[PDB]
CSV table of C-alpha atoms in Angstrom, one decimal:
chain,number,residue,atom,x,y,z
A,1,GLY,CA,111.0,172.3,269.9
A,2,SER,CA,113.9,174.1,271.6
A,3,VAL,CA,114.3,173.4,275.2
A,4,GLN,CA,116.6,176.0,277.1
A,5,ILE,CA,117.8,175.4,280.8
A,6,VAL,CA,120.0,178.2,282.5
A,7,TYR,CA,121.1,177.3,286.0
A,8,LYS,CA,123.1,179.6,288.1
A,9,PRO,CA,123.1,179.5,291.9
A,10,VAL,CA,124.9,182.6,293.3
A,11,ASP,CA,126.1,182.2,296.7
A,12,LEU,CA,127.9,184.5,299.2
A,13,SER,CA,128.2,183.2,302.6
A,14,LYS,CA,130.1,183.0,305.7
A,15,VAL,CA,130.1,180.5,308.5
A,16,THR,CA,132.0,182.2,311.0
A,17,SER,CA,133.4,182.1,314.7
A,18,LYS,CA,135.3,184.4,316.9
A,19,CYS,CA,136.5,183.0,320.1
A,20,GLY,CA,138.6,184.6,323.2
A,21,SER,CA,139.6,181.5,324.8
A,22,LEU,CA,138.9,177.7,324.5
A,23,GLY,CA,140.2,176.0,327.7
A,24,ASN,CA,140.2,174.5,331.1
A,25,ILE,CA,138.2,171.6,329.5
A,26,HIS,CA,138.5,168.3,331.5
A,27,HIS,CA,137.2,164.8,330.3
A,28,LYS,CA,137.9,162.2,332.9
A,29,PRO,CA,135.7,158.8,332.4
A,30,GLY,CA,135.3,156.7,335.5
A,31,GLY,CA,136.3,153.5,333.4
A,32,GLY,CA,133.2,151.2,332.5
A,33,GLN,CA,132.2,147.8,331.8
A,34,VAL,CA,130.7,146.6,328.5
A,35,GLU,CA,129.8,143.1,327.4
A,36,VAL,CA,128.3,142.0,323.8
A,37,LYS,CA,127.2,138.6,322.9
A,38,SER,CA,126.1,137.4,319.3
A,39,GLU,CA,126.0,134.2,317.0
A,40,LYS,CA,126.2,135.6,313.6
A,41,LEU,CA,126.7,139.0,311.8
A,42,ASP,CA,125.5,139.4,308.3
A,43,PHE,CA,126.2,142.9,306.7
A,44,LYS,CA,125.4,143.0,303.3
A,45,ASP,CA,125.5,146.7,301.8
A,46,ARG,CA,126.9,150.1,303.0
A,47,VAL,CA,126.4,149.2,306.5
A,48,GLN,CA,128.2,151.2,309.2
A,49,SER,CA,128.6,149.5,312.7
A,50,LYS,CA,130.0,149.8,316.1
A,51,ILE,CA,129.7,146.5,318.6
A,52,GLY,CA,130.6,146.8,322.3
A,53,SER,CA,132.6,150.2,322.2
A,54,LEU,CA,133.8,152.0,325.3
A,55,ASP,CA,135.0,154.8,323.3
A,56,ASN,CA,136.0,158.4,324.9
A,57,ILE,CA,136.2,161.3,322.6
A,58,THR,CA,137.2,164.9,323.3
A,59,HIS,CA,136.8,167.2,320.3
A,60,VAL,CA,137.7,171.0,320.9
A,61,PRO,CA,138.1,172.5,317.6
A,62,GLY,CA,138.8,176.3,317.5
A,63,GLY,CA,136.2,176.4,314.7
A,64,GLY,CA,134.4,173.4,313.9
A,65,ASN,CA,132.1,175.2,311.7
A,66,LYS,CA,130.5,173.2,308.6
A,67,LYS,CA,128.9,174.3,305.3
A,68,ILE,CA,127.5,171.5,303.1
A,69,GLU,CA,125.9,172.2,299.5
A,70,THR,CA,124.5,169.9,297.2
A,71,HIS,CA,123.5,171.2,293.6
A,72,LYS,CA,121.8,168.9,291.0
A,73,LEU,CA,120.3,169.0,287.3
A,74,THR,CA,118.5,166.0,285.8
A,75,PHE,CA,117.2,165.8,282.3
A,76,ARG,CA,115.2,163.4,280.3
B,1,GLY,CA,106.8,174.3,271.1
B,2,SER,CA,109.8,176.1,273.1
B,3,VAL,CA,110.5,175.5,276.8
B,4,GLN,CA,112.6,178.1,278.6
B,5,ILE,CA,113.6,177.5,282.3
B,6,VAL,CA,115.9,179.9,284.3
B,7,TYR,CA,117.0,179.0,287.5
B,8,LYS,CA,118.7,181.5,289.9
B,9,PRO,CA,118.8,181.2,293.5
B,10,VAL,CA,120.9,184.1,295.1
B,11,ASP,CA,122.0,183.8,298.7
B,12,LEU,CA,123.8,186.3,300.7
B,13,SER,CA,124.1,185.2,304.5
B,14,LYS,CA,126.0,185.0,307.5
B,15,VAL,CA,126.0,182.1,310.5
B,16,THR,CA,128.2,183.7,313.0
B,17,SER,CA,129.2,183.4,316.7
B,18,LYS,CA,131.4,185.5,318.9
B,19,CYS,CA,132.4,184.2,322.3
B,20,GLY,CA,134.2,185.9,325.1
B,21,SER,CA,135.5,182.4,326.5
B,22,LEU,CA,134.3,178.9,326.4
B,23,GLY,CA,135.8,177.0,329.6
B,24,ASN,CA,136.0,175.5,333.0
B,25,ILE,CA,133.9,172.7,331.3
B,26,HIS,CA,134.0,169.2,333.3
B,27,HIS,CA,132.8,165.9,332.2
B,28,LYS,CA,133.4,163.1,334.7
B,29,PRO,CA,131.2,160.0,333.7
B,30,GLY,CA,130.6,157.8,336.8
B,31,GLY,CA,131.7,154.7,335.0
B,32,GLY,CA,128.9,152.6,334.1
B,33,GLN,CA,127.8,148.7,332.9
B,34,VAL,CA,126.4,147.8,329.6
B,35,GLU,CA,125.5,144.0,328.6
B,36,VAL,CA,123.9,143.2,325.1
B,37,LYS,CA,122.7,139.8,324.0
B,38,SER,CA,121.7,138.8,320.4
B,39,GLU,CA,121.4,135.8,317.9
B,40,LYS,CA,121.5,137.0,314.5
B,41,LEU,CA,122.3,140.3,312.9
B,42,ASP,CA,121.2,140.7,309.2
B,43,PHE,CA,121.7,144.2,308.0
B,44,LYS,CA,120.9,144.5,304.3
B,45,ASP,CA,121.2,148.2,303.2
B,46,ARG,CA,122.5,151.6,304.2
B,47,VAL,CA,122.2,150.6,308.1
B,48,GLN,CA,124.1,152.6,310.7
B,49,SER,CA,124.2,150.6,313.9
B,50,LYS,CA,125.6,150.9,317.3
B,51,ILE,CA,125.3,148.0,319.7
B,52,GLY,CA,126.3,148.0,323.5
B,53,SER,CA,128.4,151.1,323.2
B,54,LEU,CA,129.5,153.0,326.3
B,55,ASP,CA,130.7,156.0,324.7
B,56,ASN,CA,131.5,159.5,326.3
B,57,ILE,CA,131.8,162.5,324.1
B,58,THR,CA,133.1,166.1,325.1
B,59,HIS,CA,132.4,168.4,322.1
B,60,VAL,CA,133.3,171.9,322.5
B,61,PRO,CA,133.6,173.6,319.2
B,62,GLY,CA,134.7,177.5,319.3
B,63,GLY,CA,132.0,177.9,316.6
B,64,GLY,CA,130.0,174.7,315.8
B,65,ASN,CA,127.9,176.6,313.3
B,66,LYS,CA,126.2,174.6,310.3
B,67,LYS,CA,124.8,175.7,307.2
B,68,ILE,CA,123.2,173.1,304.6
B,69,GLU,CA,121.9,173.8,301.4
B,70,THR,CA,120.3,171.6,298.5
B,71,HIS,CA,119.5,173.1,295.2
B,72,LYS,CA,117.7,170.9,292.7
B,73,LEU,CA,116.2,171.0,289.3
B,74,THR,CA,114.5,168.1,287.4
B,75,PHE,CA,113.2,168.0,283.9
B,76,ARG,CA,111.3,165.5,281.4
C,1,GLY,CA,115.1,170.1,268.2
C,2,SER,CA,117.9,171.7,270.2
C,3,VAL,CA,118.5,171.4,273.9
C,4,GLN,CA,120.8,173.8,275.5
C,5,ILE,CA,121.9,173.5,279.1
C,6,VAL,CA,124.0,176.3,280.8
C,7,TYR,CA,125.2,175.2,284.3
C,8,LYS,CA,127.2,177.7,286.1
C,9,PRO,CA,127.2,177.9,289.9
C,10,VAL,CA,129.1,180.9,291.4
C,11,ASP,CA,130.5,180.9,294.9
C,12,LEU,CA,132.5,183.3,297.0
C,13,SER,CA,132.0,181.7,300.7
C,14,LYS,CA,134.3,181.3,303.9
C,15,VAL,CA,134.0,178.8,306.6
C,16,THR,CA,136.2,180.8,309.0
C,17,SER,CA,137.5,180.9,312.6
C,18,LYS,CA,139.5,183.2,315.1
C,19,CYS,CA,140.5,181.8,318.3
C,20,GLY,CA,142.7,183.5,321.1
C,21,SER,CA,143.8,180.4,322.6
C,22,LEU,CA,143.2,176.5,322.7
C,23,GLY,CA,144.6,175.2,326.1
C,24,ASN,CA,144.6,173.3,329.4
C,25,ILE,CA,142.4,170.4,327.8
C,26,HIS,CA,142.7,167.1,329.9
C,27,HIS,CA,141.4,163.8,328.5
C,28,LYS,CA,142.1,161.2,331.4
C,29,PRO,CA,140.1,157.9,331.0
C,30,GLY,CA,140.0,155.5,334.1
C,31,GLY,CA,140.5,152.6,332.0
C,32,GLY,CA,137.5,150.3,331.2
C,33,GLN,CA,136.6,146.7,330.4
C,34,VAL,CA,135.1,145.6,327.2
C,35,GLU,CA,134.2,141.9,326.1
C,36,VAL,CA,132.5,140.9,322.7
C,37,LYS,CA,131.6,137.4,321.8
C,38,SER,CA,130.6,136.2,318.4
C,39,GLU,CA,130.5,133.0,315.8
C,40,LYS,CA,130.4,134.1,312.1
C,41,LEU,CA,131.0,137.6,310.8
C,42,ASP,CA,129.9,137.9,307.1
C,43,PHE,CA,130.4,141.4,305.6
C,44,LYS,CA,129.8,141.6,301.9
C,45,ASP,CA,129.7,145.3,300.4
C,46,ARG,CA,130.9,148.8,301.6
C,47,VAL,CA,130.8,147.7,305.2
C,48,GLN,CA,132.6,149.8,308.0
C,49,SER,CA,132.8,147.9,311.3
C,50,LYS,CA,134.4,148.4,314.7
C,51,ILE,CA,134.2,145.5,317.2
C,52,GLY,CA,135.2,145.5,320.9
C,53,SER,CA,136.9,149.0,320.6
C,54,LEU,CA,138.2,150.9,323.8
C,55,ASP,CA,139.3,154.0,321.9
C,56,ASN,CA,140.3,157.2,323.4
C,57,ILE,CA,140.5,160.2,321.2
C,58,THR,CA,141.6,163.9,321.6
C,59,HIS,CA,141.0,166.0,318.6
C,60,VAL,CA,142.0,169.8,319.1
C,61,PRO,CA,142.4,171.4,315.7
C,62,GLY,CA,143.0,175.1,315.5
C,63,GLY,CA,140.4,175.3,312.7
C,64,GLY,CA,138.5,172.0,312.0
C,65,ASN,CA,136.2,173.7,309.5
C,66,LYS,CA,134.5,171.8,306.8
C,67,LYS,CA,133.2,172.9,303.5
C,68,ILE,CA,131.6,170.2,301.2
C,69,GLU,CA,130.1,170.7,298.0
C,70,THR,CA,128.5,168.4,295.4
C,71,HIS,CA,127.7,169.5,291.9
C,72,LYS,CA,125.9,167.0,289.6
C,73,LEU,CA,124.5,167.1,286.0
C,74,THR,CA,122.8,164.1,284.5
C,75,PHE,CA,121.3,163.9,280.9
C,76,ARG,CA,119.4,161.1,279.3
D,1,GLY,CA,145.2,135.2,405.6
D,2,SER,CA,145.8,132.6,402.6
D,3,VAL,CA,144.5,133.4,399.1
D,4,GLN,CA,143.9,130.3,396.5
D,5,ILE,CA,142.8,130.9,392.8
D,6,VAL,CA,142.4,128.0,390.5
D,7,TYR,CA,141.6,129.1,387.0
D,8,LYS,CA,140.7,126.5,384.5
D,9,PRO,CA,138.7,126.9,381.5
D,10,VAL,CA,138.2,123.6,379.7
D,11,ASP,CA,137.3,123.9,375.8
D,12,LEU,CA,136.2,121.1,373.5
D,13,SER,CA,134.9,122.5,370.4
D,14,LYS,CA,134.6,122.5,366.6
D,15,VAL,CA,134.0,125.2,364.4
D,16,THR,CA,133.2,123.4,360.9
D,17,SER,CA,132.2,123.8,357.2
D,18,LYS,CA,131.6,121.1,354.6
D,19,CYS,CA,131.0,122.3,350.8
D,20,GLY,CA,130.4,120.5,347.8
D,21,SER,CA,131.7,123.4,345.6
D,22,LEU,CA,132.2,127.2,345.8
D,23,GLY,CA,132.1,128.5,342.1
D,24,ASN,CA,130.7,130.2,339.1
D,25,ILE,CA,131.2,133.6,341.0
D,26,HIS,CA,131.5,136.7,338.9
D,27,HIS,CA,132.7,140.3,340.3
D,28,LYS,CA,132.5,142.8,337.7
D,29,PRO,CA,132.7,146.4,338.8
D,30,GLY,CA,131.3,148.9,336.5
D,31,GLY,CA,134.3,151.2,336.9
D,32,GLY,CA,133.6,154.1,339.4
D,33,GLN,CA,134.4,157.7,340.0
D,34,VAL,CA,135.9,159.0,343.5
D,35,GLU,CA,137.2,162.5,344.6
D,36,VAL,CA,138.2,163.5,348.1
D,37,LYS,CA,139.5,167.0,349.1
D,38,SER,CA,141.0,167.9,352.4
D,39,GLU,CA,143.3,170.3,354.0
D,40,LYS,CA,145.1,168.9,357.3
D,41,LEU,CA,145.2,165.2,358.5
D,42,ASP,CA,146.3,165.2,362.1
D,43,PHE,CA,146.3,161.6,363.3
D,44,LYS,CA,147.8,161.0,366.8
D,45,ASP,CA,147.1,157.4,368.0
D,46,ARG,CA,146.3,154.1,366.9
D,47,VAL,CA,144.3,155.5,363.8
D,48,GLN,CA,143.3,153.0,361.1
D,49,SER,CA,142.2,155.2,358.1
D,50,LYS,CA,141.1,154.9,354.4
D,51,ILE,CA,140.7,158.2,352.2
D,52,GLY,CA,139.3,158.3,348.7
D,53,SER,CA,139.7,154.5,347.9
D,54,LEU,CA,138.0,152.7,345.0
D,55,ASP,CA,138.9,149.2,346.2
D,56,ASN,CA,137.2,146.0,344.9
D,57,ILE,CA,137.5,142.7,346.8
D,58,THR,CA,136.6,139.1,345.8
D,59,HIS,CA,137.3,136.8,348.9
D,60,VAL,CA,136.1,133.2,348.6
D,61,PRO,CA,137.6,131.2,351.2
D,62,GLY,CA,137.0,127.4,351.1
D,63,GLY,CA,136.5,127.8,355.0
D,64,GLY,CA,136.7,131.4,356.4
D,65,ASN,CA,135.6,130.0,359.8
D,66,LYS,CA,136.9,132.2,362.8
D,67,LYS,CA,137.3,131.2,366.4
D,68,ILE,CA,138.5,134.1,368.8
D,69,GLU,CA,139.1,133.6,372.7
D,70,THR,CA,140.5,135.7,375.6
D,71,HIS,CA,141.2,134.2,378.8
D,72,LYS,CA,142.2,136.7,381.4
D,73,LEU,CA,143.0,136.8,385.1
D,74,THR,CA,143.9,139.9,387.2
D,75,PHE,CA,145.1,140.0,390.9
D,76,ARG,CA,145.9,142.8,393.4
E,1,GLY,CA,149.6,135.4,404.2
E,2,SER,CA,150.4,133.1,401.2
E,3,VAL,CA,148.9,133.7,397.7
E,4,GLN,CA,148.5,130.6,395.3
E,5,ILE,CA,147.6,131.1,391.7
E,6,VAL,CA,146.9,128.1,389.4
E,7,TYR,CA,146.2,129.1,385.7
E,8,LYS,CA,145.6,126.3,383.5
E,9,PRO,CA,143.4,126.7,380.5
E,10,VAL,CA,143.0,123.4,378.5
E,11,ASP,CA,142.0,123.5,374.9
E,12,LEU,CA,141.0,120.9,372.5
E,13,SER,CA,139.6,122.5,369.4
E,14,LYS,CA,139.4,122.3,365.7
E,15,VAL,CA,138.8,125.1,363.1
E,16,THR,CA,137.9,122.8,360.0
E,17,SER,CA,136.8,123.2,356.6
E,18,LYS,CA,136.2,120.6,353.6
E,19,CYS,CA,135.6,121.8,350.1
E,20,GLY,CA,134.8,119.7,346.7
E,21,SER,CA,136.2,122.6,344.5
E,22,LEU,CA,136.9,126.3,344.5
E,23,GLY,CA,136.9,127.5,341.0
E,24,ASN,CA,135.4,129.5,337.9
E,25,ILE,CA,135.7,132.6,339.8
E,26,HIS,CA,136.2,135.8,337.9
E,27,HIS,CA,137.1,139.4,339.1
E,28,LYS,CA,136.9,141.8,336.3
E,29,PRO,CA,137.1,145.4,337.5
E,30,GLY,CA,135.9,148.0,335.0
E,31,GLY,CA,138.7,150.4,335.7
E,32,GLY,CA,137.8,153.4,337.8
E,33,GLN,CA,138.9,157.0,338.6
E,34,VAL,CA,140.1,158.3,342.0
E,35,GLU,CA,141.6,161.7,342.9
E,36,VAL,CA,142.7,162.8,346.4
E,37,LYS,CA,143.9,166.4,347.4
E,38,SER,CA,145.6,167.6,350.6
E,39,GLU,CA,147.9,170.1,352.2
E,40,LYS,CA,149.5,168.4,355.5
E,41,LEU,CA,149.4,164.9,356.6
E,42,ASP,CA,150.7,164.7,360.4
E,43,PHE,CA,150.6,161.0,361.6
E,44,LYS,CA,152.3,160.6,365.3
E,45,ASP,CA,151.6,157.2,366.5
E,46,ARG,CA,150.6,153.6,365.2
E,47,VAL,CA,148.7,155.2,362.4
E,48,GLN,CA,147.8,152.6,359.5
E,49,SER,CA,146.7,154.8,356.4
E,50,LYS,CA,145.6,154.2,352.6
E,51,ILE,CA,145.1,157.4,350.6
E,52,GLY,CA,143.7,157.4,347.0
E,53,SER,CA,144.2,153.5,346.5
E,54,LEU,CA,142.4,151.8,343.5
E,55,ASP,CA,143.4,148.5,344.8
E,56,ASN,CA,141.7,145.0,343.5
E,57,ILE,CA,142.0,141.9,345.5
E,58,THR,CA,141.2,138.3,344.7
E,59,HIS,CA,141.5,136.1,347.6
E,60,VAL,CA,140.6,132.4,347.5
E,61,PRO,CA,142.4,130.5,350.2
E,62,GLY,CA,141.5,126.7,350.2
E,63,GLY,CA,141.0,127.3,354.0
E,64,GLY,CA,141.3,130.8,355.1
E,65,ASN,CA,140.5,129.6,358.7
E,66,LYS,CA,141.6,131.7,361.7
E,67,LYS,CA,141.9,130.7,365.4
E,68,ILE,CA,143.2,133.7,367.6
E,69,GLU,CA,143.8,133.3,371.4
E,70,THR,CA,145.0,135.6,374.1
E,71,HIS,CA,145.9,134.1,377.5
E,72,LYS,CA,146.9,136.5,380.2
E,73,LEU,CA,147.8,136.9,383.8
E,74,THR,CA,148.5,140.0,385.7
E,75,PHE,CA,149.5,140.4,389.3
E,76,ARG,CA,150.0,143.4,391.6
F,1,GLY,CA,154.5,135.5,402.8
F,2,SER,CA,155.1,133.2,400.0
F,3,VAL,CA,153.5,134.1,396.4
F,4,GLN,CA,153.1,131.0,394.0
F,5,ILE,CA,152.1,131.4,390.5
F,6,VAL,CA,151.6,128.1,388.3
F,7,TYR,CA,151.0,129.0,384.7
F,8,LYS,CA,150.2,126.1,382.4
F,9,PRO,CA,148.3,126.3,379.2
F,10,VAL,CA,147.7,123.1,377.5
F,11,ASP,CA,146.6,123.1,373.8
F,12,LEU,CA,145.8,120.5,371.2
F,13,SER,CA,144.1,122.4,368.5
F,14,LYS,CA,144.1,122.2,364.6
F,15,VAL,CA,143.4,124.7,362.0
F,16,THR,CA,142.8,122.5,359.1
F,17,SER,CA,141.5,122.5,355.5
F,18,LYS,CA,140.9,119.9,352.7
F,19,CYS,CA,140.1,121.1,349.3
F,20,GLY,CA,139.4,118.9,346.2
F,21,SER,CA,140.5,121.7,343.7
F,22,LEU,CA,141.7,125.4,343.3
F,23,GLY,CA,141.5,126.7,339.9
F,24,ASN,CA,139.9,128.5,336.9
F,25,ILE,CA,140.4,131.8,338.8
F,26,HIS,CA,140.6,134.9,336.8
F,27,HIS,CA,141.5,138.4,338.0
F,28,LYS,CA,141.5,140.8,334.9
F,29,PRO,CA,141.6,144.6,336.0
F,30,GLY,CA,140.5,147.1,333.3
F,31,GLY,CA,143.2,149.5,334.3
F,32,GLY,CA,142.3,152.8,336.3
F,33,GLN,CA,143.5,156.0,337.0
F,34,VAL,CA,144.6,157.7,340.3
F,35,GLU,CA,145.8,161.0,341.4
F,36,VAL,CA,147.2,162.1,344.8
F,37,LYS,CA,148.3,165.7,345.6
F,38,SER,CA,149.8,166.6,349.0
F,39,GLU,CA,152.3,169.3,350.5
F,40,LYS,CA,153.9,167.9,353.8
F,41,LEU,CA,153.9,164.3,355.1
F,42,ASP,CA,155.1,164.1,358.6
F,43,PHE,CA,155.1,160.5,359.9
F,44,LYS,CA,156.5,160.3,363.4
F,45,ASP,CA,156.0,156.6,365.1
F,46,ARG,CA,155.1,153.1,363.8
F,47,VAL,CA,153.2,154.6,360.8
F,48,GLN,CA,152.3,152.1,357.8
F,49,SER,CA,151.0,154.4,354.8
F,50,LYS,CA,150.1,153.7,351.3
F,51,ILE,CA,149.6,156.7,348.9
F,52,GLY,CA,148.2,156.7,345.3
F,53,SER,CA,148.5,152.9,345.0
F,54,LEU,CA,147.0,151.0,342.0
F,55,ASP,CA,147.4,147.5,343.6
F,56,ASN,CA,146.2,144.3,342.0
F,57,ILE,CA,146.6,141.2,344.2
F,58,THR,CA,145.6,137.6,343.4
F,59,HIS,CA,146.2,135.2,346.5
F,60,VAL,CA,145.3,131.8,346.1
F,61,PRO,CA,147.0,130.0,349.0
F,62,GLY,CA,146.1,126.0,349.2
F,63,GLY,CA,145.6,126.5,353.0
F,64,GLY,CA,145.8,130.3,354.0
F,65,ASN,CA,145.0,129.1,357.6
F,66,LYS,CA,146.1,131.1,360.7
F,67,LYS,CA,146.6,130.3,364.3
F,68,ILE,CA,147.8,133.1,366.6
F,69,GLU,CA,148.3,132.9,370.3
F,70,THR,CA,149.7,135.5,372.9
F,71,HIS,CA,150.5,134.1,376.2
F,72,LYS,CA,151.4,136.7,378.8
F,73,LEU,CA,152.4,136.9,382.6
F,74,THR,CA,153.1,139.9,384.5
F,75,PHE,CA,154.2,140.5,388.1
F,76,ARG,CA,154.5,143.9,389.9
């Protein structure tokens, strides 16, 4: 017999920010020391890797807001 | 016999921030020391890895608001 | 028998920012020391890798807002 | 009446070192952070001064032996 | 009356070193951060000064031996 | 009456070194950050000064030995 699916998500959304000022922000790393020692690396599927980083990041977005959605229908 | 699905989420929402100022922020890492020692690194599926990192982050979003949604329907 | 799918997402949504000023942002790394030591690096599928980085980043977008959607339908 | 001084130190001496090896010496400072804040520095006679230094020294003399002597006579 | 001074220091001395090897010496400063802040620096006689230095030294003399002597006679 | 000074230092002395090898010496500074801030620098007599230096030195003399003598006679 008949199968009917009706799928309708309805979305109204706001991810919002109001800021009067971003500033006078200081990031001043005092150096640093790193050592890493290995024999063999063997990365076989979808691997994300960092080895021995000394990474300094300053990230000052006026917004930096995120909205993430997934919508999925599966039929058998 | 007949099968009927009706799938309807409805969303009305706000994820909001109001800020008079973000500021006078100091991040001053005092240096540092790291040592890592290994033999074999077999990573086989979907691995996220950090090894021996000395990573400094200053993250100062004016918003930084997140909204995450999943909508899923499955049928047999 | 008959199969009917109707798939109709409806979205009106905003990932929004208002910022009065971005400024006076200082990123001043005091150098640093990194060493990495290895023999064999076998990377076989979809691998993303960093080895021995000393990376300074300053990222200051006036917005930097993200909206991500995935819409998927599968039938068998 | 008559005054006689005879001033005669006699020195026979050795200040000696014998070493089979100096080596495999590692000095690896982990970075560091210094801040100094001042108004007025009035230095008036024979001052030796260091302010806000972050100085690293590795000093590995094969000898480094010291002999210091003063021989002094005063008459009125 | 008559005054006689005889001043005769006699020195036989050795400041000696024997070394089979100096080596495999590593000095690896991890960077560093210095800040110094002042208004007025009034230095008036014989002043030796360092301000805000980040000075790295590796000093590996095959000898580095010192002999220092002062011989003084004063008459009034 | 008569005044006689006889001033006669006698010295046989050696500041000596024997070294089988100087070598495999590594000096590898990881950079660094310096800031110095001032208004007035009034230096008036015999002043030696360093301000805001970032100085790396490697000094590896085969000898590096010192002998210093001062001989002084004063009459009034």
